Amino acid sequence: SSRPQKKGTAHHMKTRPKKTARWDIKRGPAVYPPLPPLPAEWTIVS
Amino acid sequence: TDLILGRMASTIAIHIRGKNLASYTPSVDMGAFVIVVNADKVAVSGKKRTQKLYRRHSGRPGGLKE
Amino acid sequence: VDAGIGVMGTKLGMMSFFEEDGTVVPVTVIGFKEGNIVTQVKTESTDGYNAVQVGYERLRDRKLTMPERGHLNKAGVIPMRHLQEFRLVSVDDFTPSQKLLFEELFKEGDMVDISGTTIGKGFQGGIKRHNFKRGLMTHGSKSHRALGSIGAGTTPGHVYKGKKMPGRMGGTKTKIRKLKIMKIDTDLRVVMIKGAVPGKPGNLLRLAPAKI
Amino acid sequence: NAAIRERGVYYNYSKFIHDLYKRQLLLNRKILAQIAILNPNCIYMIYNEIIK
RNA sequence: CGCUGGGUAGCCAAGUGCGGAGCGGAUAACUGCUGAAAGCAUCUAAGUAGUAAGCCCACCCCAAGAUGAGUGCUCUCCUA
RNA sequence: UUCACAUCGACGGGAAGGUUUGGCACCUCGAUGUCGGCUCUUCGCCACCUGGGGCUGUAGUAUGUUCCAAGGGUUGGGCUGUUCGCCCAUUAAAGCGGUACGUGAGCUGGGUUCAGAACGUCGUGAGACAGUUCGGUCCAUAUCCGGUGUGGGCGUUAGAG
RNA sequence: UCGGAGAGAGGCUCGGUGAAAUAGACAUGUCUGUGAAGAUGCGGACUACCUGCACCUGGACAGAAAGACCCUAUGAAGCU
RNA sequence: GGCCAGUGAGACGAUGGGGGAUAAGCUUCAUCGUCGAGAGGGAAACAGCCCGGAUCACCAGCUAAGGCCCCUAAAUGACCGCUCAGUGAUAAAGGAGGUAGGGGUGCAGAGACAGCCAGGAGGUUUGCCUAGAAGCAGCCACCCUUGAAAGAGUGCGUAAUAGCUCACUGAUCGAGCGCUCUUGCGCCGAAGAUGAACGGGGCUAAGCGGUCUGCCGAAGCUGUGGGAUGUAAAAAAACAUCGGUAGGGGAGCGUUCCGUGUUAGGGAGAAACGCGUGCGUGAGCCGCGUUGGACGAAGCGGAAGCGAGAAUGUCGGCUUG
RNA sequence: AACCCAGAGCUAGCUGGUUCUCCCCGAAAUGCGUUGAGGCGCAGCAGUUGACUGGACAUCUAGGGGUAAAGCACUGUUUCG
RNA sequence: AGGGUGAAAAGAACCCCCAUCGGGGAGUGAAAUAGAACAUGAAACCGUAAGCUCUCAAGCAGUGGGAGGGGGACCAGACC
């Protein structure tokens, strides 16, 4: 035989989810245009 | 008739839960009854018909049903 | 699915028929308390299968309840105790109105199968249910007649289902097969049949032709 | 998602957020999933103004 | 059972009967039939034939708590 | 006899398995009881036989080797505590292993060779030997799972046979 | 071989009397995988109505009892 | 420096090595990351692998790792190619007209490949051996001629011959045919003992490679509000911080007794025991009791036989079986 | 090498256990030495109180090397003419 | 190892059950639920009554959401 089985934390460096597609690493979050600031949350009315 | 099995099973599942209704709560039975006629003529793709096994087993060993 | 209608009769002891060639054969003697009247036929139209329903042991009306005797008087026949059907292929010509069928249909057919309640032996051990062996009777042994090992070691952690334990042995019906018929009696209402039927003299006994 | 998918034409939950942030609606906070069942004509007005 | 001699009914075998059937279905290895991708060929890529104590069914029994809780026949619900 | 590939295959190489002896010391020593036998399983195929086939330096019988196939079987004994093994009579064949000896909360002998004694050898001696021989207590009412039987309740949308 | 029958005392049922070892709480399945590398308790699947009685003991690394074997202690003791 | 602790059994992963058999979740070192002492998300489950550092609340939003058929949140999304083995979890040497390409080199409209048919002869049985060896048991070279081409022969066969047949050429139809390297994904090699056992169902895409847009996705970040620590030495306000084992420091609650105390209060119900739609960061306080019947608060202080879930603890009571 | 009492609450580098709350900080499993290896003393790394200090993190420059790579100029070793 | 009915035995006259033990009325007492096992009586433990709910169900028995139902209610939206 002479093939070692990959045990714990060697199983984790092999069988962890790795996204090995060079496209899907390039993705940043989407950017919307900036909006004007929202008004005050409330106002004193006397 | 001439519908493939697993995608039909998923689109029957998405109505059998109730995930096409806005009243979907996953703790109650908001689903819908479905009826599937012509189960004898369900299509499959590839080599499911001669290579996919619905094996079962009782508790005792040596009872795995081919 | 059976290959034809059968009858039912009671066991009345055993004896030996002397064949005129010189042989001595052990036969069981079958009596007939009452004729096996076809009570209810169930065809492919009004039922999912086809079977002919006969009965046996004409009795007193006090012995029989209202649904039983109402079912039997739906056919216009005598009130009788036992009641069994034979499933038969759809070529049948059987009226449920009092067909007192005579026992001539088995003599030329020199092969018959029989079913019956074997005699019960109660809660018996593994030494007679499943034909085990006993341990050493001597040499310092202690597991006389006991059940021995039950399972494997740690890796199952349980015992397999259907494992041969002691339990109630007899009481269920059995069918012994292809039993060759012998001298019927057209006046003694008695059929010789060479073999050994299940049970002591007195019990019900299915007597139906073979299924080979 | 189950409320938007009742249109029949292929409009997913992702496209409702496509044209929910492009048409500038700051942060309805998924309480349109509450008035999506308490006020289904009002969420039909929400979505039918997301289309235009 | 004082020790022996036999024995009916039970129980049992060493005794007595019976069973292991199927030109039934599909296959594994193999032999093929036409037969192309390379006008030759090849059991195969289309279709298809023989065939295993193996698989399933048939065989004997239990069996609708099979909560999917079946089907058929029949009886009974009255007085204020 | 010619002929690498009917059958063996030197010099070398590549694997699978975890059944031997090993390596590590990762669970267990406020206790995981080793070896053999009896009883009783069940499973694997790396096939001894049975069923089908290919090739044969297969004339036929019998083969040699190999493919599919684990349904079923795989004897009785003399020696030894024996596993293994030798031998006799055979048989279609008398397969190899896993399941913590598979199985000592089911059972008994050699042993982790316990306490007595003797022989050889070692030691000045007390004593000791992975040397030998005789004798040498082995517990247990099943709580739960698991199993084999056998009920009772309730359900099966009226209640039953 | 190769078991078989019968008689007692138990075992089973009823009436009386009535413990014990053990015990974190137990609403206490099987396979397979993972995990302190042998899981009813974690994961996936399958299977199981609830709850008794009588037997059997494969597991709960079952009960005992701070392993007699192995090693450590600048431990104890006997003996030479 | 002063006072004062633990720790000195480590583990895995990457790199650099030694021991081994470049075998071990093996052993010993050197730098680093995590666990130890680290919660959450992805990894089916699963200390050490990736993201990530948990003060607390919200029935808030945006994201990292990773995913978007169903179980289970988000795309049965779009456009190029590939795989037909359920490969998609797996291990090699080696084999292969598998399929999708790519680079070389050789033949063709003066007919290129595959099949049928025709020829394949003369010296010659080259010279040795053998009975024969005539190409076919073998040894040595292994010719030229007619020609369209023929090799002392490619194999079978025969006692040897004879003979069947091929490399090569001629002829009919006709337009692609070889033989090498090479990747991508595949096939076989590839077989275990209880039972699908590879998350499941399943899918020819829901698989594998290349891009494009969005969404889901943590206790991360942001937002809105509290608490505490450090600045800091009063308050307010500000900025930073606030996971934690062994351990260190600061601040507090409770208990019984004592000083005030022959305290206030109390047979118009004290302590106890039981109760809460109350308050605190919590240890706890306060309040209510058709129970009970005589003691005893708070505040400001002190002293402990001072706080219980563990010791095969121990003493009583009562279970299980 | 009896039992009881007493020294004796012998001794144990060993085992188990050591009880209320909140806040801040926060390791180590390394070296040396040891009749020592599962103990201990010191150093390393915590907590708190200070006294001197002006550094950390990025970038650049300068110094010694002899590792990786490489090479046969020394020491060996080796294939062929 | 085993203390504490009351302030005072004033310790239950008499009637019934009845062989006793004990129990219920009546009487003493401020209290008889202070009755001689007698003072406050907690937890484990054993029970009985009322409300909701479990017999296709896999679960360190919780927690977040909460179907259905029940109870008093007054900030009737709240609480259990």
Structural overview:
This is part of a larger assembly, with chains A (46 residues), B (66 residues), C (212 residues) and D (52 residues). Chain A is low in regular secondary structure and 46 residues long. Chain A has one helix at residues 22-25. By secondary structure, chain B is mainly alpha-helical. Chain B contains 2 helices and no strands. In chain D, 48% of the residues lie in helices and 0% in strands. The longest helix of chain D is centred in the last third of the chain and has 12 residues, at 40-51. The two termini of chain D are 20 Å apart. The relative contact order of chain D is 0.17. At the B-D interface, loops of B face loops of D. Chain C binds 6 RNA strands through β2, α1, α2, β9 and β10. Chain B: This is Large ribosomal subunit protein uL13c. Chain B: Belongs to the universal ribosomal protein uL13 family.
Question: Concise description?
Answer:
This is part of a larger assembly, with chains A (46 residues), B (66 residues), C (212 residues) and D (52 residues). Chain A is largely without helices or strands and 46 residues long.
Describe the protein's topology.
This is part of a larger assembly, with chains A (46 residues), B (66 residues), C (212 residues) and D (52 residues).
Chain B: H1 5-17, H2 48-51
Chain C: E1 7-18, E2 24-31, E3 37-42, E4 51-58, H1 66-74, E5 80-87, E6 99-100, E7 112-117, E8 123-124, H2 126-129, E9 167-168, E10 173-179, E11 181-185, E12 190-194, E13 204-209
Antiparallel strand pairs in C: 1-2, 1-13, 2-12, 3-4, 3-6, 4-5, 7-10, 7-13, 8-9, 11-12
Chain D: H1 13-21, H2 35-38, H3 40-51
The structure holds 6 RNA strands.
PDB class: ribosome
Keywords: Cryo-EM, ribosome, chloroplast ribosome
Entry title: Structure of the 70S chloroplast ribosome from spinach
